[PDB]
């Protein structure tokens, strides 16, 4: 059973953006899904200073960097708090409508695309490199669900009876053809000295059988 659903046209904008706009520092992407892992962490652990009990379905609170050469995935993991079917649904937990204008009206000001961040929307730099992305996700509050997009103005929510998470979100990267150096460990490495250096959480990147 696959709901699908039309992005909001501000959405699917900048989408289009990301997409098509002449942009060589693609790299940003892994900054920003990072960042976003880690302030879904900082949510659980501020919601279990006061409820031990959010932390039942896994006390971990970590980042796993999971490439896939076989697949041509990269997987981005936390242990944060998850997103229900609504958080979904209304543009993965953000204020996207309103984060795009803003953006846009940065980019008219001499921003640049690695600036996306600033406006609430770093989830959909994803698709620098990615030519679909599936987010698994599971909240305290509600059931697994697969969200996932190939852009094209739209996305499905479907219910994942794929291996349970306990809590947390994947974002699966589906990258294009000439991005697969994101799947090289020393690539990886690079750009998490050089963006993720201070993130408060382990960032751990899972090696490959060659």
């Known amino acids: 059973e696959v709901e699908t659903f039309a992005f909001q046209a501000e959405i699917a904008q900048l989408m289009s953006l990301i997409i098509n706009t002449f942009y060589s520092n693609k790299e940003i992407f892994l900054r920003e899904l990072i960042s976003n892992a880690?302030?879904?962490?900082?949510?659980?652990?501020?919601?279990?200073?006061?409820?031990?009990?959010?932390?039942?379905?896994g006390k971990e609170l970590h980042i796993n960097l999971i490439?896939?050469?076989?697949?041509?995935?990269?997987?981005?993991?936390?242990?944060?708090?998850?997103?229900?079917?609504?958080?979904?649904i209304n543009n993965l937990g953000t204020i996207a409508k309103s984060g795009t204008k803003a953006f846009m009206e940065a980019l008219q000001a001499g921003a640049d695309i690695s600036m996306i961040g600033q406006f609430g929307v770093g989830f959909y730099s994803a698709y620098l490199v990615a030519e679909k992305v599936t987010v698994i996700t599971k909240h305290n509050d509600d059931e697994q669900?697969?969200?996932?997009?190939?852009?094209?103005?739209?996305?499905?929510?479907?219910?994942?009876?794929?291996?349970?998470?306990?809590?947390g979100t994947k974002v699966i990267l589906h990258l294009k053809e000439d991005q697969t150096e994101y799947l090289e460990e020393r690539r990886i490495k690079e750009i998490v000295k050089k963006h993720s250096q201070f993130i408060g959480y382990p960032i751990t990147l899972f090696v490959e059988k060659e």
Do not use: H
């Open 38 to 57: 880690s302030d879904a962490l900082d949510k659980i652990r501020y919601e279990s200073l006061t409820d031990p009990s959010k932390l039942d379905s």
């Open 145 to 167: 669900y697969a969200w996932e997009s190939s852009a094209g103005g739209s996305f499905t929510v479907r219910t994942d009876t794929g291996e349970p998470m306990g809590r």
């Open 67 to 88: 490439p896939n050469k076989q697949d041509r995935t990269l997987t981005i993991v936390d242990t944060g708090i998850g997103m229900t079917k609504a958080d979904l």
